[PDB]
Each structure stands twice: as C-alpha cells, then as structure tokens.
Amino acid sequence: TPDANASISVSYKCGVKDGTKNTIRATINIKNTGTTPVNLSDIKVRYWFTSDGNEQNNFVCDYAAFGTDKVKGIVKKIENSVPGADTYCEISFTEDAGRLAPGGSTGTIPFRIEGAAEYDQTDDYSYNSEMSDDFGDNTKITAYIKDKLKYGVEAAA
C-alpha cells in the first residue's frame, strides 16, 4: 500500500551532561528514505527512559531549521514498565511544520528533557553514550508515520 511504502529513518547524537545531572540532552535528524514526500505532521519520534522518580519531566526543543515552534513534545508514563523504560517522550510536529522530500531530512533537532531531580541515563533504553562524537543509527529510538512503526524497536517486556 502507499502507506506501507513510506519510509523514514532517524539518526541520533547523545548530548552532554554535567553536575546537576537533571537534563537529558540529545539531537535527532529525521530522513525521508522513501520515494514519496512525507509530511512532518505525520511523524512522531519516541525516546524511551526511566525517569528515576521524577514525576515531572519537561520537553524543550532548542533548534529546528523550520522553527522550534513547529516541534512538540509530551512525556508520558508507561503503566507496565519494561527494560529501560517507565516513561517515554513523544516528539511530534505541528500541521504547518512542512514536509520532507524524498531523500530529504530535517538536519539537527536538539532537545532537552528536564527534571527536578537527577537523571541516571545509563538505565534508559534510548540512551547510547557510544554515539556522542558522531550521529549514529540508534534503533532504540522509534519513529512512526501515521502512528505506524517505521524506525527502531520499541521498548518492550
């Protein structure tokens, strides 16, 4: 089917951490790997993690070529937690965000997930410190077109 044929990939770079240790930093780059355009409004990305007691976990996008105001994020609890995830951050795009041509991509989209208390990122499904120096194929980040899985493997028991 036409929807079956749409394809995207995501690349990832692990950000920096300091001393307060209450900020998850990462950058993603979403590519249209198919032969027809994709609307950004149809794309969602999930970052799976353990919130380490933080009830409040706030998403911020710090840059996007098409404007930070096009990028949305919600952080939700997982009821039946799984290895590396009791929470996920779901990144999405506004209706007016634009579209990716075949072979096109967003380029860097850096974001933060902010908590009051410290995050230990080592016990997060989507965290991969091996991808700090260069963008890599972090298949523990998932992406969706019209709510159908197109990239990565979901955290799961």
Q: How far is the CB of 114 from Ca ion (least distance, A)?
A: 14
Tokens representing residue 142 in the block: 């998932």
What is the rounded distance in angstroms from the CA atom of residue 61 to the CA atom of residue 16?
Answer: 15
Q: Are 153 and 77 in contact (CB under 8 A)?
A: no
The H-assigned helical ranges of the chain are 2-5
- The site string for Ca ion over 112-131 (x = CB under 5 A, - otherwise) reads --------x--xx-------
Q: How far is the CB of 109 from a copy of itself (least distance, A)?
A: 8
Tokens representing residue 96 in the block: 């007016």
68 lines the binding site for a copy of itself (CB under 8 A): no
103 lines the binding site for a copy of itself (CB under 8 A): yes
- The reply to whether 147 sits in an annotated binding site is no
| Of positions 106, 121, 138, 142, contacts a copy of itself by CB under 8 A | 106
146: alpha, beta or left? (left if phi > 0; alpha if psi -120 to 50): left
Cβ neighbours for 70, distance < 8 A, ≥ 6 positions apart: 40, 64, 93, 94, 96, 97, 98
Q: How far is the CB of 82 from a copy of itself (least distance, A)?
A: 31
Please say which residue, 42 or 52, places its beta carbon nearer to Ca ion: 52
What is the rounded distance in angstroms from the CA atom of residue 137 to the CA atom of residue 54?
Answer: 28
The residue range among 48-56, 59-67, 69-77, 124-132 that interacts with a copy of itself, by the rule CB under 8 A, is: 59-67
113 lines the binding site for a copy of itself (CB under 8 A): no
Q: What residues make contact with a copy of itself under the rule CB under 8 A?
A: 11, 29, 32, 37, 63-66, 98-109, 135
Q: What residues make contact with Ca ion under the rule CB under 5 A?
A: 50, 52, 120, 123-124
